[PDB]
């Protein structure tokens, strides 16, 4: 759908300098202002480069567009943790696909952060839940990093396949990463096992909570 | 100090219409267009159409088949965008925009979202996750609220008013297989602030109208 071609993903160091390119033709980037925005995961997109190259208000100068042709590149200097969003380019466009078209966006990442193994918290079923006939076991994954884990559940010893869900890690306000994964049980489910564990997987090795009714 | 400010997430039927408005502040309201685009969850921006506040010119995306239709109120500087005979493919946070020339489009609203869905709103089910001698470690204990079955999207959560924001992570919403969604959101505190410190978590589900403050407390 995206008229305007840019890499799905793009990544750095810190302190690299990223490029990320927009191609399109003579009716759009060749003949028209390009426009850049950068995006963080739930906000909006927000202006970066205006008219190929401008910076509007409180845009630091290590963030250039530029164009050439019927081509355009976003450059970032002095990459940091902090630039880890989306980034999209955009164009007035002049033929039917016009008046106005994007660029399919591309994430950048930001490599060479400091490895942390995740802390692992097991919440039981809260009372309330137990005395409105429900139980949920929550497991909270925090402060690691790469942002990848597995999660497995046992009852017991026994593994647990139904009753799973699990979500994407995503950034803490400390730039690491969190995840989440929960169990959905019966009171008497619950009740009825000595213990229940909730087993991480981060970087091949694994961190595994316990907790007993 | 360019202000643009959206109405709230809604739930609508197929077949259905949506109206969303889009409140501008800080410039001359007719000094510049304003654009809709939308974005599909996780997925990137399609640009809907734009209207000109000073002379009424309107221009649609043709993908959309005619369904959208674009008005502005300049008494109260506030845009609206209609689309109408809703399907779940249409289901998407909605920008509004404003547009020109050199600038293209520059400043953004917060985005509304619009889940097109045969089923009814339903709030949330709040729990409270205590902190204990099993959730604490070496100093410092995770406490937290489980904001359970609710639907649609969005659901947001603060701490004690607002009051409390260092050490607390909102976990991203999963989708049940009852299609509803479940969320939780963590905080971690100090042990030795367990006695003498309260927590309440504000839970708000705008489309059901609902709000929760579950208190948690020591087991």
């Known amino acids: 759908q995206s008229v305007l071609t840019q890499p799905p993903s793009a990544s750095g160091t810190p302190g690299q300098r990223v490029t990320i390119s927009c191609s399109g033709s003579?009716?759009?980037?060749?003949?028209?202002?390009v426009y850049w925005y950068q995006q963080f995961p739930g906000t909006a997109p927000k202006l970066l480069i205006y008219?190929?190259?401008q910076r509007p208000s409180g845009v630091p100068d290590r963030f250039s567009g530029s164009k050439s042709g019927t081509s355009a590149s976003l450059a970032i200097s002095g990459l940091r943790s902090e630039d880890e969003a989306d980034y999209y380019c955009?164009?007035?466009?002049?033929?039917?696909?016009?008046?106005?078209?994007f660029g399919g966006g591309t994430q950048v990442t930001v490599l060479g952060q400091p490895k942390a193994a995740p802390s692992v918290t097991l919440f039981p079923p809260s009372s309330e839940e137990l005395q409105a006939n429900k139980a949920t076991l929550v497991c909270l994954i925090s402060d690691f990093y790469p942002g990848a884990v597995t999660v497995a559940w046992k009852a017991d010893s026994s593994p647990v396949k139904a009753g799973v869900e699990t979500t994407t890690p995503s950034k803490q306000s400390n730039n690491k990463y969190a995840a989440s994964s929960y169990l959905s049980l019966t009171p008497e489910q619950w009740k009825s096992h000595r213990s229940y564990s909730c087993q991480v997987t981060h970087e091949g090795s694994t961190v595994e909570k316990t907790v007993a009714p | 100090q360019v202000q643009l400010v959206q109405s709230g997430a809604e739930v609508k039927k197929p077949g259905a219409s949506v109206k969303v408005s889009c409140k501008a502040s800080?410039?001359?309201?007719?000094?510049?267009?304003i654009s809709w685009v939308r974005q599909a969850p996780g997925q990137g921006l399609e640009w809907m159409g734009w209207?000109?506040?000073?002379?009424?010119?309107?221009n649609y995306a043709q993908n959309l088949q005619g369904r959208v239709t674009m008005t502005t109120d300049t008494s109260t500087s506030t845009a609206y965008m209609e689309l109408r005979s809703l399907r779940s493919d249409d289901t998407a946070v909605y920008f509004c925009?404003?547009?020109?020339?050199?600038?293209?489009?520059?400043?953004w609203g917060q985005g509304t979202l619009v889940t097109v869905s045969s089923a009814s709103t339903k709030g949330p089910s709040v729990f409270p996750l205590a902190p204990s001698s099993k959730s604490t470690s070496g100093g410092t204990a995770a406490l937290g609220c489980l904001v359970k079955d609710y639907f649609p999207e969005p659901v947001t959560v603060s701490w004690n008013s607002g009051a409390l924001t260092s050490g607390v992570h909102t976990f991203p919403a999963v989708l049940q297989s009852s299609g509803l969604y479940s969320l939780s959101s963590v905080v971690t505190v100090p042990s030795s602030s367990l006695g003498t410190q309260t927590y309440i978590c504000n839970v708000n589900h705008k489309p059901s109208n609902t709000k929760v403050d579950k208190r948690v407390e020591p087991k």
């Open positions: 003579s009716s759009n980037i060749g003949s028209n202002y």
């Open positions: 925009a404003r547009a020109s020339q050199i600038r293209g489009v520059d400043y």
């Open positions: 209207i000109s506040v000073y002379n009424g010119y309107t």
């Open positions: 800080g410039y001359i309201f007719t000094s510049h267009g």
């Open positions: 008219g190929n190259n």
């Open positions: 955009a164009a007035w466009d002049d033929s039917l696909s016009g008046p106005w078209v």
